[PDB]
Amino acid sequence: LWPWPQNFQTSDQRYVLYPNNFQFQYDVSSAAQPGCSVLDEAFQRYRDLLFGTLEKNVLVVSVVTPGCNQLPTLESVENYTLTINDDQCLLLSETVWGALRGLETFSQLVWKSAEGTFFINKTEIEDFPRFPHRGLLLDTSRHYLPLSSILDTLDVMAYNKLNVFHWHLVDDPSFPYESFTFPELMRKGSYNPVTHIYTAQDVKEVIEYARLRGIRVLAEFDTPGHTLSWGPGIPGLLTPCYSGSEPSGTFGPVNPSLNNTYEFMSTFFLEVSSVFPDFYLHLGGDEVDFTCWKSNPEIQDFMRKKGFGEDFKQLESFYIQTLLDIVSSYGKGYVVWQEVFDNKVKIQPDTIIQVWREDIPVNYMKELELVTKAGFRALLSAPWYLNRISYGPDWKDFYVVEPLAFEGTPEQKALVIGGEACMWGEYVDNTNLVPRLWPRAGAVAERLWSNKLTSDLTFAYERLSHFRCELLRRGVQAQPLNVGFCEQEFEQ
Amino acid sequence: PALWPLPLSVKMTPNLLHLAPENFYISHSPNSTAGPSCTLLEEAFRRYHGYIFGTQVQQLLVSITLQSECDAFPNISSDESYTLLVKEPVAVLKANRVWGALRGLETFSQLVYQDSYGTFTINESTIIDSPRFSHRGILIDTSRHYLPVKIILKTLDAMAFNKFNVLHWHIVDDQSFPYQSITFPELSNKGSYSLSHVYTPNDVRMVIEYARLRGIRVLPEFDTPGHTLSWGKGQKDLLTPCYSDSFGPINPTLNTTYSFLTTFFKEISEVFPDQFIHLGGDEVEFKCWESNPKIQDFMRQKGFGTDFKKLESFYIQKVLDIIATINKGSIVWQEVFDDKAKLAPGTIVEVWKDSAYPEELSRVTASGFPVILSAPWYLDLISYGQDWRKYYKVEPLDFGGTQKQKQLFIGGEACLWGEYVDATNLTPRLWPRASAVGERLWSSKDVRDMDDAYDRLTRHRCRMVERGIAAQPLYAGYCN
Ligand SMILES: *[C@@H]1O[C@H](CO)[C@@H](O[C@@H]2O[C@H](CO)[C@@H](O[C@@H]3O[C@H](CO)[C@@H](O)[C@H](O)[C@@H]3O)[C@H](O)[C@H]2NC(C)=O)[C@H](O)[C@H]1NC(C)=O
Ligand SMILES: *[C@@H]1O[C@H](CO)[C@@H](O[C@@H]2O[C@H](CO)[C@@H](O[C@@H]3O[C@H](CO)[C@@H](O)[C@H](O)[C@@H]3O)[C@H](O)[C@H]2NC(C)=O)[C@H](O)[C@H]1NC(C)=O
Ligand SMILES: *[C@H]1O[C@H](CO)[C@@H](O[C@@H]2O[C@H](CO)[C@@H](O[C@@H]3O[C@H](CO)[C@@H](O)[C@H](O)[C@@H]3O)[C@H](O)[C@H]2NC(C)=O)[C@H](O)[C@H]1NC(C)=O
Ligand SMILES: *[C@@H]1O[C@H](CO)[C@@H](O)[C@H](O)[C@H]1NC(C)=O
Numbered sequence: 001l002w003p004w005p006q007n008f009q010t011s012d013q014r015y016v017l018y019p020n021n022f023q024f025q026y027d028v029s030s031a032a033q034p035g036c037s038v039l040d041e042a043f044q045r046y047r048d049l050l051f052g053t054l055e056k057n058v059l060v061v062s063v064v065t066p067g068c069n070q071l072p073t074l075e076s077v078e079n080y081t082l083t084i085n086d087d088q089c090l091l092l093s094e095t096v097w098g099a100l101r102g103l104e105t106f107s108q109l110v111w112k113s114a115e116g117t118f119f120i121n122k123t124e125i126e127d128f129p130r131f132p133h134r135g136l137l138l139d140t141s142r143h144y145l146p147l148s149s150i151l152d153t154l155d156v157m158a159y160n161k162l163n164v165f166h167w168h169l170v171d172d173p174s175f176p177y178e179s180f181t182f183p184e185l186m187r188k189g190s191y192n193p194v195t196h197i198y199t200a201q202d203v204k205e206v207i208e209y210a211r212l213r214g215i216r217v218l219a220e221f222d223t224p225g226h227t228l229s230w231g232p233g234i235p236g237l238l239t240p241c242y243s244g245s246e247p248s249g250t251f252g253p254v255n256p257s258l259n260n261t262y263e264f265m266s267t268f269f270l271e272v273s274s275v276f277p278d279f280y281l282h283l284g285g286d287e288v289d290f291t292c293w294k295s296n297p298e299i300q301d302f303m304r305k306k307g308f309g310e311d312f313k314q315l316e317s318f319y320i321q322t323l324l325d326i327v328s329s330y331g332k333g334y335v336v337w338q339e340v341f342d343n344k345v346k347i348q349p350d351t352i353i354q355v356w357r358e359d360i361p362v363n364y365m366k367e368l369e370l371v372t373k374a375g376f377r378a379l380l381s382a383p384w385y386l387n388r389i390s391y392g393p394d395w396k397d398f399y400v401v402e403p404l405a406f407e408g409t410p411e412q413k414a415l416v417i418g419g420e421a422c423m424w425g426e427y428v429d430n431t432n433l434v435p436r437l438w439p440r441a442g443a444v445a446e447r448l449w450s451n452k453l454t455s456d457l458t459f460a461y462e463r464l465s466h467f468r469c470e471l472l473r474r475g476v477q478a479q480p481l482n483v484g485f486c487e488q489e490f491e492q
Numbered sequence: 493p494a495l496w497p498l499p500l501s502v503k504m505t506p507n508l509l510h511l512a513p514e515n516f517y518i519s520h521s522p523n524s525t526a527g528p529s530c531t532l533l534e535e536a537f538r539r540y541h542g543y544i545f546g547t548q549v550q551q552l553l554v555s556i557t558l559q560s561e562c563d564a565f566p567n568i569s570s571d572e573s574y575t576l577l578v579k580e581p582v583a584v585l586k587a588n589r590v591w592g593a594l595r596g597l598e599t600f601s602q603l604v605y606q607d608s609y610g611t612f613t614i615n616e617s618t619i620i621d622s623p624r625f626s627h628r629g630i631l632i633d634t635s636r637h638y639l640p641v642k643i644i645l646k647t648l649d650a651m652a653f654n655k656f657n658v659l660h661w662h663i664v665d666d667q668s669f670p671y672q673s674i675t676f677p678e679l680s681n682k683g684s685y686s687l688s689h690v691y692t693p694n695d696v697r698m699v700i701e702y703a704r705l706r707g708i709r710v711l712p713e714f715d716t717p718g719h720t721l722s723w724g725k726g727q728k729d730l731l732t733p734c735y736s737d738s739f740g741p742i743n744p745t746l747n748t749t750y751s752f753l754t755t756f757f758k759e760i761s762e763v764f765p766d767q768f769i770h771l772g773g774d775e776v777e778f779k780c781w782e783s784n785p786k787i788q789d790f791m792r793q794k795g796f797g798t799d800f801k802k803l804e805s806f807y808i809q810k811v812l813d814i815i816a817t818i819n820k821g822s823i824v825w826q827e828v829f830d831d832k833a834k835l836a837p838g839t840i841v842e843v844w845k846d847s848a849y850p851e852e853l854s855r856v857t858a859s860g861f862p863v864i865l866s867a868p869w870y871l872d873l874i875s876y877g878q879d880w881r882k883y884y885k886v887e888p889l890d891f892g893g894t895q896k897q898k899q900l901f902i903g904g905e906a907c908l909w910g911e912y913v914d915a916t917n918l919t920p921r922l923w924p925r926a927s928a929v930g931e932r933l934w935s936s937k938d939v940r941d942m943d944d945a946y947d948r949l950t951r952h953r954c955r956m957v958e959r960g961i962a963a964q965p966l967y968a969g970y971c972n
Contacts, residue, residue, distance in 0.1 A: 143965060143968060143970070144970060174968075174970075191969075191970040388876045389875070391874050391912075425968070426968055427877070427878075427964065428964075431920050431962045431964050432917070432920035432921075432962070432964045435916050436917075477916050479914070479916045480637060480912060480913075480916070480917075482912065483636045484637075485638055485686070485689060487688070489915060490914070490916045491642065491915060
């Protein structure tokens with residue numbers, strides 16, 4: 001089992017399963033019934049994974065009705081109970097998304113002996129996630145990622161019970177997103193206007209694919225920093241840096257002193273809010289350099305009119321405030337990096353802050369304290385930067401992290417809604433994504449789902465390594481934790 | 493030009509020459525010592541005709557000067573030198589041996605490209621090239637993690653593109669014994685992870701002949717007396733029992749040990765056609781030997797006192813003779829040399845420790861023994877960023893010694909120990925970080941420009957990806 005359930009009562013009493021004659025059926029009592037897109041496909045997908053006294057059936061009953069066509073939200077309940085004994089074999093979930101979790105848990109409990117016989121132990125489970133926001137970040141800018149690689153990642157996120165896909169579509173070196181409101185962004189920003197592109201068809205497939213797995217799609221079009229690929233296509237958007245008197249070629253962050261800029265963002269983010277159905281959008285706001293703005297004389301003049309002065313922290317605030325209003329008018333929530341909070345930017349009470357920095361300006365645990373005491377919600381990602389590789393089993397570092405290990409009151413700590421693992425693509429693409437992702441990302445997966453008390457490294461290794469071999473069986477190219485072997489070694 | 497490694501001498505001219513897929517031929521020169529009867533070249537011609545494609549130059553004539561050595565196995569003294577001439581209407585590739593022709597064909601394929609319209613083109617030029625060092629290898633660990641034959645063969649293809657010529661096969665170790673022995677079938681039957689995780693005679697034969705066709709030597713290593721916890725599964729009383737219940741290294745007091753090794757290494761001498769055989773002899777712990785009453789007696793009857801370095805030297809010299817008896821060379825880790833053991837003339841030493849390794853190189857060369865470097869190139873020890881620069885900056889001949897001692901330095905190896913490496917992450921983690929070592933061991937000493945290195949390595953990396961090698965990127969960018 002991975003991740004480890006909140007309440008799992010095991011036994012040694014076993015039952016025999018039948019690969020072919022095993023079927024998933026709804027209970028007449030259930031809210032979700034034949035026609036439930038999510039579960040119909042789930043039953044099919046899981047029977048392929050498993051089989052691609054005795055038990056022939058598995059009853060699935062959802063109490064909360066809310067269809068199977070509407071996408072998951074931050075408020076969605078993932079509670080479920082797995083009851084398997086002599087009398088019954090029932091999977092009782094509160095919602096449709098809890099059933100998905102239940103099926104995954106069920107899939108890992110199915111085992112086979114040295115004879116090859118399929119079995120299933122007498123089990124009683126009462127499970128639920130510790131945090132509602134369990135995400136994983138992919139950087140499709142520094143290196144383009146084929147649609148197949150993204151869909152594969154979503155398949156494994158489902159195995160680890162991760163429910164948020166932090167899509168970092170664009171950045172400095174590449175703009176692979178194809179915009180229909182501004183077609184020049186993709187045509188002159190992407191590495192290649194044809195082969196390395198994300199169409200409207202690609203995006204809607206990701207969303208629906210993720211939806212079937214009960215995964216939210218958090219889109220991030222980082223602004224005003226990390227926007228070098230925006231330059232060409234939409235002229236005048238970026239800030240032309242200065243040497244002193246005349247401009248010297250290089251461009252900086254988005255120019256917040258032009259009317260053209262705000263009418264562009266209003267039109268562009270209208271599309272973004274239309275394409276991505278999720279309630280929240282990530283607006284970035286990280287690593288914003290004030291150097292290029294200060295050097296520019298035309299921008300220096302702008303701050304004297306509005307009366308900001310010498311601090312660009314409130315100049316940045318002016319940009320983000322306006323940007324938040326635009327996105328807020330479309331009925332969209334928003335997540336933002338920690339810089340926005342650190343730079344005292346006028347911010348809406350419902351904004352979520354994502355802690356990513358380790359030491360500067362303050363320790364990441366001290367950050368969660370400030371953000372929560374300030375009243376805002378927070379995501380933790382600081383110690384979960386998978387892109388930062390090191391020798392040995394650093395998954396133990398990720399696993400031992402305690403998100404609520406800071407100074408605060410019960411309700412203050414309740415503002416922490418989870419976190420995300422981050423795979424920045426500076427040194428990662430289609431060639432080494434999977435092995436570098438899993439099963440290191442599984443360490444974060446369990447820490448965000450399981451209970452505070454599940455922390456034994458020895459117990460973690462046993463299950464994670466066992467889960468690692470299972471991943472390989474499912475076709476996942478996951479790297480080894482340490483010396484050892486899987487009977488079915490990876491070979492494709 | 494996206495050449496890697498960078499040849500000794502390159503004379504490029506802005507004159508374009510076009511090629512035609514179903515019209516370009518690679519055949520032997522009328523006055524060559526090698527002809528259509530040479531299987532190695534025949535295979536290399538068809539193989540590179542696929543890499544190249546998949547004012548007109550119509551044919552590439554391959555002329556072998558000296559005795560080709562077409563059907564022979566490559567050794568440390570092989571001649572990989574070659575000269576290339578790109579001109580119309582006949583391109584000329586001339587080399588002394590067949591080994592140079594292979595390296596030349598690789599270089600020639602790296603010169604052909606497609607222009608803006610897809611037209612196969614190549615700037616006419618003149619290239620004279622030869623390896624700075626003769627021993628350029630890659631170490632793979634198939635014991636800590638079993639590696640399917642396919643990935644080993646792919647590693648060989650990748651080594652061919654990067655001009656490596658030695659495959660240091662660290663086949664067995666503590667964790668497992670995947671090598672299937674003909675004389676002692678119990679070693680693999682009880683010492684391997686499982687029976688499916690085993691290298692049968694034919695699997696080994698396939699690796700060797702696949703490597704030969706590409707000019708790669710297969711250097712086997714059966715580490716002794718340390719790193720042998722798996723050896724004591726199918727062989728009783730071979731390992732030292734630890735009293736005071738685990739086991740230790742191989743017992744060097746019993747005559748059963750040396751009788752076993754003799755028949756074992758006699759098999760190895762006929763399985764692996766390479767002259768040299770790595771014996772290991774590293775990280776040997778004396779903890780267990782020191783706590784064995786029977787062994788402490790062997791210390792008296794020989795008068796070694798309490799210095800087990802002599803008991804270590806006693807064992808390794810016994811093994812060295814066995815290898816010398818069967819007309820084979822020997823390679824060994826630095827511990828053995830440091831343990832004051834007596835090595836035969838021609839014995840190779842491999843330096844692998846960080847702590848003052850240039851000083852080790854000095855000591856080994858001073859004693860008149862050939863040396864190989866691997867200390868700074870432990871690729872298994874990964875880190876964040878472009879660490880390929882750290883490996884590229886390394887200069888091997890930077891140690892105290894005469895000009896006569898520098899000739900004893902024959903090359904180095906990039907090691908990828910498998911404590912955390914298997915088929916899932918080997919290729920990406922190995923390349924193109926090992927490519928940095930390849931150029932440092934083939935190209936001239938004065939080839940150290942970073943901007944140019946980075947420029948050519950990114951484009952060469954994309955070439956490996958197109959050839960089926962999943963090499964990871966150096967930084968942000970794209971291929972195709
Ligand atoms: C589901 O139930 C099955 C059996 O109904 C459990 O399988 C049992 O797993 C244990 C733990 O590995 C096995 O015991 C082992 O025995 C060897 C010696 O034979 C001992 O040296 C090991 O330390 C280990 O204890 C056992 O063979 C196996 N079946 C039996 C008869 O108990 C399984 O644990 C259950 N699944 C879970 C984890 O809930
Ligand atoms: C999904 O599971 C969560 C947690 O298992 C449920 O939330 C928790 O529900 C329990 C019982 O309803 C609450 O316990 C109660 O706490 C109050 C004090 O606030 C106390 O007076 C009661 O005696 C009782 O112990 C608990 O507060 C609540 N929160 C958590 C996170 O533990 C949730 O109800 C489940 N979802 C559904 C709709 O079934
Ligand atoms: C064979 O390779 C040579 C050497 O790399 C190539 O010659 C290159 O030709 C290009 C195209 O004209 C030159 O680029 C030019 O640069 C100047 C500025 O110096 C610029 O003003 C022009 O617009 C043009 O882009 C380039 O200098 C030259 N050499 C290099 C270093 O690339 C060529 O691709 C091949 N031979 C020929 C002449 O077809
Ligand atoms: C920008 O100028 C246009 C043209 O009048 C106007 O409609 C819009 O309100 C301006 N946006 C602002 C106030 O930034």
